[PDB]
Amino acid sequence: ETTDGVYRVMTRRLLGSTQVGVGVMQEGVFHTMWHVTKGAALRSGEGRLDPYWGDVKQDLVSYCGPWKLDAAWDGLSEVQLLAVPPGERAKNIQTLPGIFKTKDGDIGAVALDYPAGTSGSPILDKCGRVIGLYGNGVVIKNGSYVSAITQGKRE
């Protein structure tokens, strides 16, 4: 129920399901973006995953334990988005990040545009480590999208 890998986050009422996001299971902890789940509990098969750590400003939440993803973008190299769009199998897209310049420092950012329910898809370094999650960003003048490479802290 917590096997390592990438997962879709789905919602269902009385009728069909909607993919609201994606996340990463690593070391028994599920990692996604806050705006996907609003910090609510998740079902995994017959089990319940309870929120553990989170931070709305970072737009991140972990389930079952503290945030485990520690790898950092090296500030230089190309990365891959492992996009898991609604209704499509996972696909890898390589890109050279740009930069969100903020008053508190620079954050890598990827100019890749996918449906809203792709939120939480992992961004990878060349070793396959998760350097952040896709899906919190800005819309630039022409309507296209740029996502921060959002990473939490492993305490």
């Binding site: 910090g39 929120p51 931070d55």
Partner: peptide, 4 residues
């Protein structure tokens, strides 16, 4: 909680 913005559990702490």
């Amino acid at each position: 909680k913005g559990k702490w």
